[PDB]
Amino acid sequence: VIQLKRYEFPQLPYKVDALEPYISKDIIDVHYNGHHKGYVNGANSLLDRLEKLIKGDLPQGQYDLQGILRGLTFNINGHKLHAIYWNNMAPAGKGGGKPGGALADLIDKQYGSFDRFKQVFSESANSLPGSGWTVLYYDNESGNLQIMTVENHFMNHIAELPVILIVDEFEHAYYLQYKNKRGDYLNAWWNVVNWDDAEKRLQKYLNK
Amino acid sequence: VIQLKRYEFPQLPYKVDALEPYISKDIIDVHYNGHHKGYVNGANSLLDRLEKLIKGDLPQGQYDLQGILRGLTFNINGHKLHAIYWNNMAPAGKGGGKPGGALADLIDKQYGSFDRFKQVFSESANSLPGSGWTVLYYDNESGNLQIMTVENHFMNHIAELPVILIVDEFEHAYYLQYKNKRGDYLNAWWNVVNWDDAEKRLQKYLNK
Amino acid sequence: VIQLKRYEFPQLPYKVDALEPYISKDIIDVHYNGHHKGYVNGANSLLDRLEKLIKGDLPQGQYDLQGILRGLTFNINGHKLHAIYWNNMAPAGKGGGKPGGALADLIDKQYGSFDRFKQVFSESANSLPGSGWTVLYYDNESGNLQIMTVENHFMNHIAELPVILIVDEFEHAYYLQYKNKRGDYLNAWWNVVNWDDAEKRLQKYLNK
Amino acid sequence: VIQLKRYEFPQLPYKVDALEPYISKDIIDVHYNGHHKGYVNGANSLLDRLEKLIKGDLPQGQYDLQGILRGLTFNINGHKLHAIYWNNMAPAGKGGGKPGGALADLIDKQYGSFDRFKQVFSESANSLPGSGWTVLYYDNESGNLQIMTVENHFMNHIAELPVILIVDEFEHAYYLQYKNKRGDYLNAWWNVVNWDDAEKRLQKYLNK
Ligand SMILES: [Fe+3]
Ligand SMILES: [Fe+3]
Ligand SMILES: [Fe+3]
Ligand SMILES: [Fe+3]
């Protein structure tokens, strides 16, 4: 009777030091156990309030709806985006390299080559004003692999499009190790990208 | 060799006066032939520039990337959201009423009844500060039908989630007929909602 | 004992039909008596809640602070910006023309001439994505007359800078008369600009 | 002939280790020499482009206006806000304590006491979703000392209002020392607040 489901904190796909030396375990530890866990808790605590509101246990005058709704995009996106992020990376050996399969083929057709794509993606990522993410969506309508800079966790998303590749650009994602050198972090990140994961996500929407 | 696909302007699913008296033909005409068409043109014109940039025809110093990327979320979302909007409505007789199928079942389980859902959805829609949309997403992860107010065409979306129900709240969607009476417009809109379309969208992601 | 002041609804500097034929009285009437009045009421109603919160009459758990704070930037800016807007315009005869005094001098030095300034200001105003305003600030630090497109009523402002010139670009500011032809409205607006008001605002910060 | 002025990088009002132990010199060093300097450089580089555009040296098709304008609010605000921030703090001994003068009087009248104000200001600061600032404006219109959470450097400002008190909440402002413990940083910050500077800013707008 009147009930919403809550989110679960996912498990890290590897050990906290599996991405070294590109991303120190010091960062992964707090990034995962601190920030990500916090987004799940924040989202669940706001879902409790929304649930009470829907039931009538929280009467008008005892809440400010915009505070609950905006708090949910922030926290829900924070959780979902980090969940993709962890899986979109892989330990030094398994991760990195060049893409393959349909993904490699689309990148060639739309960017000319993986090198140009890397150049354009990096340029876009460096253009992001402040904290956010840079994502690569697959547009089933046009068939384009669309690059986009996302501000915070919830601004600039293209509705319904699946994420193929993603980089976290919040300062907590690299500060302990790279400080204000975001460009250095971005160059390092390329070495731990999990192209298998990326190709798997693409295959899920190809010709569907 | 290096080429991105462009977007196509879709056809209206009915005559421009098919939603009367809830939404006058004067609004539908310019909303569709004016605004929507403009988003498709704007998106395509920006894709041309991005394509040139990728090819190298547009050299560094002859563009401002953030202007191109942010212009794209604005226009692409403007197009995609309007495309759903037209299909999410139906002529007086065909549209309106109460939902059915899996959608009606989920609404009862999470909101208690269609009447409460209507109340909560309307309350959320009326809380939107300024121009934007109010959407109902289906979260495959939690199984929740999440309500959200989207600012402009690109702020507050929850990444990757499909749109099940949607209402345009930009002033151009009702001003000619309702003026500043946004609440009156929202009450009228319920009479043209296409629940068949909504149920179809949900069925696409159920148990998948 | 613990009390915040509320905002007062200002009087229109002229009759609702004083800006015709550039801006119809139909627009001014609802724009002033409808929208502006609504921002003052919205801001005051939120100030009541914040006041109760500060006093302790509204206990934790009966409010969502972000909903109150963000609601205040929206409404307070909505009120303040419209208040400047009304005074920044003048009836056909009194308004329009070319600026004079220190303002005309600065525009010449920074834009080459009033014609170029008009061209650049119009180009910026037309580039605004969605609803908002285009403003001309006077930067006391650098001495520059900075143009800026403001999204909604509260995004993109440059902290502490005074507004010298301003155009409302929310759809309700021109829709009844120009429909989706925002560019036509912008061209018309130039005919009712109150340069005396603009020069007065500038003089207030020159050499101070 | 057609020329805009550029911004100058200000000097730190004290040594980079003058705020210890509340804010380590490691943070101040890169925060000042890295981040702040970068905002000044970013702003000036964009002003160069805008200047060229105005002169005609940068022809249409070789720039994306929104990229230039939005890049300017980001950078100009980043610079101006940091400039206030440095002056709004003072070495352990000189800074901290309780406010005095007109400021202390207004806080008592509107918040009941400095302790409540501190509680409310801290509650607001901790509610900020993501990176940004929490500011205290003085509204000459109403006479209220308005608290506000600013997202990034440019979202949520109330037009034209002067900043009286301010706290940087971008992760780079405390991560090296406090990691994700933003609340701990906010508690420490109260010990270095420069109330003399704050009172001076207020006196500038009182009865004027
Ligand atoms: Fe992160
Ligand atoms: Fe629309
Ligand atoms: Fe307006
Ligand atoms: Fe900072």
D54 belongs to a structural domain: yes
User: In terms of domains, do A72 and A165 share one?
Assistant: no
Find chain B residues with C-beta within 8 A of D65's C-beta.
Answer: 64, 67
Q: How many CB pairs under 8 A join A and B?
A: 130
User: In terms of domains, do C187 and C133 share one?
Assistant: yes
Asked whether the beta carbons of D155 and C155 are under 8 A apart, the reply is yes
Residue C168 assigned to a binding site: yes
Q: Is D103 helix (H, G, I), strand (E, B) or coil?
A: helix
- Report the separation in Å between the CA atom of A136 and the middle of ligand 1, taken as the mean of its atom positions: 17
Cβ partners under 8 Å of residue B151, min gap 6: B128, B129, B130, B131, B132, C152
Question: Are A63 and C63 in contact (CB < 8 Å)?
Answer: yes
Does the CA dihedral B38-B41-B44-B46 come out positive or negative? negative
User: In terms of domains, do D136 and D201 share one?
Assistant: yes
Which chain D residues touch B if contact means CB-CB below 8 Å? 49, 61-68, 70-71
Which helix or strand (DSSP H or E) is residue D133 part of?
Answer: strand D132-138
Q: How many domains does chain D have?
A: 2
Q: Is A197 helix (H, G, I), strand (E, B) or coil?
A: helix
Which helix or strand (DSSP H or E) is residue C145 part of?
Answer: strand C145-151
Asked whether the beta carbons of C122 and C45 are under 8 A apart, the reply is no
A207 belongs to a structural domain: yes
Q: Strand A132-138 to strand A145-151: parallel, antiparallel, or no bridges (unpaired)?
A: antiparallel
Single-letter amino acid code for the residue at D126? N
B148 belongs to a structural domain: yes
C78 belongs to a structural domain: yes
CA A147 to CA A125: how far, in whole Å? Answer: 9
CA D106 to CA D205: how far, in whole Å? Answer: 13
Q: Which of A1, A70, A159 sits opposite B157 (nearest CB)?
A: A159
> Which of A109, A116, A155 is the best residue to mutate to test the B interface, defined by the most B CB atoms within 10 Å of its own CB?
A155
A12 belongs to a structural domain: no
Residue-range definition of the domain harbouring residue B46: 24-90
B12 belongs to a structural domain: no
Question: Are A111 and B2 in contact (CB < 8 Å)?
Answer: yes
CA B111 to chain centre: 23
Give the closest residue to C2 by CA, choosing from C48, C41, C45: C48
Asked whether the beta carbons of A161 and A137 are under 8 A apart, the reply is yes
User: In terms of domains, do D50 and D116 share one?
Assistant: no
- Sheet containing strand C145-151, edge to edge, reads C145-151, C132-138, C163-168
- Report the separation in Å between the CA atom of B75 and the middle of ligand 2, taken as the mean of its atom positions: 12
Question: Are D129 and A71 in contact (CB < 8 Å)?
Answer: yes
Asked whether the beta carbons of A107 and B54 are under 8 A apart, the reply is no
Residues contributing to the annotated binding site of A for Fe cation: 31, 82, 168, 172
Asked whether the beta carbons of C167 and C174 are under 8 A apart, the reply is no
Cβ partners under 8 Å of residue B204, min gap 6: B162
Q: Which of A30, A74, A179 sits opposite D180 (nearest CB)?
A: A30
CA D205 to CA B4: how far, in whole Å? Answer: 55
User: In terms of domains, do D195 and D101 share one?
Assistant: yes
Number of the ligand closest to the Cα of C170: 3
Residue D153 assigned to a binding site: no
Asked whether the beta carbons of D17 and D25 are under 8 A apart, the reply is yes
Number of the ligand closest to the Cα of D31: 4
Q: Can the peptide bond before residue B21 be classed as cis, meaning omega within 30 degrees of 0?
A: yes
Q: How many residues does chain A have?
A: 208
CA B68 to CA B47: how far, in whole Å? Answer: 8
User: In terms of domains, do A112 and A195 share one?
Assistant: yes
Residues contributing to the annotated binding site of B for Fe cation: 31, 82, 168, 172
Full DSSP string of B37-60: HHHHHHHHHHHHHHHHHHHTSS-T
CA C132 to CA C114: how far, in whole Å? Answer: 24
Find chain D residues with C-beta within 8 A of A130's C-beta.
Answer: 74, 131, 152-153, 170
User: In terms of domains, do D149 and D207 share one?
Assistant: yes
User: In terms of domains, do B101 and B170 share one?
Assistant: yes
Touching chains, C (3+ CB pairs < 8 A)? A, B, D
Bridge partners (DSSP) of residue C136 are: C147, C165
Asked whether the beta carbons of A66 and A18 are under 8 A apart, the reply is no
For residue D129, give the chain A residue with the closest CA: A74
CA D166 to CA D146: how far, in whole Å? Answer: 12
Question: Are A175 and D171 in contact (CB < 8 Å)?
Answer: yes
- Report the separation in Å between the CA atom of B179 and the middle of ligand 2, taken as the mean of its atom positions: 15
CA C108 to chain centre: 24
User: In terms of domains, do B70 and B101 share one?
Assistant: no
Find chain B residues with C-beta within 8 A of C177's C-beta.
Answer: none
Give the closest residue to A2 by CA, choosing from B104, B101, B107, B165: B107
Cβ partners under 8 Å of residue D159, min gap 6: C77, C80, C81, C157, C163
CA C63 to CA C71: how far, in whole Å? Answer: 13
User: In terms of domains, do C149 and C205 share one?
Assistant: yes
Please report where in the chains the tokens 């001076």 appear, as a residue. D200
Q: Could you give the dihedral angle defined by the CA atoms of residues D176, D181, D184 and D189, in that order, rounded to the nearest 10 degrees?
A: 50
Single-letter amino acid code for the residue at C11? Q
Last residue of a domain, one of D43, D62, D90: D90
Residue D31 assigned to a binding site: yes
> Which of B50, B73, B152 is the best residue to mutate to test the A interface, defined by the most A CB atoms within 10 Å of its own CB?
B73
Asked whether the beta carbons of B16 and B26 are under 8 A apart, the reply is no
Q: Which of A54, A73, A142 sits opposite B156 (nearest CB)?
A: A73
Give the closest residue to B206 by CA, choosing from B140, B144, B149: B140
User: In terms of domains, do B77 and B170 share one?
Assistant: no
Asked whether the beta carbons of A157 and B154 are under 8 A apart, the reply is yes
Please give, rounded to a whole number of angstroms, the shortest distance from the CA of A58 to a CA of chain C: 8
Cβ partners under 8 Å of residue C67, min gap 6: A63, A64, A65, A66, A67, A68, A70
* CATH code, B149: 3.55.40.20
Last residue of a domain, one of D90, D116, D147: D90
Residue C115 assigned to a binding site: no
Question: Are A160 and B160 in contact (CB < 8 Å)?
Answer: yes
Please report where in the chains the tokens 């909560």 appear, as a residue. B120
Cβ partners under 8 Å of residue D200, min gap 6: none
Which helix or strand (DSSP H or E) is residue B26 part of?
Answer: helix B25-30
User: In terms of domains, do B52 and B151 share one?
Assistant: no
* CATH code, D35: 1.10.287.990
Last residue of a domain, one of D66, D90, D114: D90
C15 belongs to a structural domain: no
D32-44 burial: b if 16+ Cβ within 10 Å, else e: beebbbebbebbb
C19 belongs to a structural domain: no
Give the closest residue to A91 by CA, choosing from A156, A143, A21, A148: A21
CA D150 to CA D167: how far, in whole Å? Answer: 10
Please give, rounded to a whole number of angstroms, the shortest distance from the CA of C28 to a CA of chain D: 23
Question: Are A66 and C65 in contact (CB < 8 Å)?
Answer: no
Number of the ligand closest to the Cα of C83: 3
Residues contributing to the annotated binding site of A: 31, 82, 168, 172
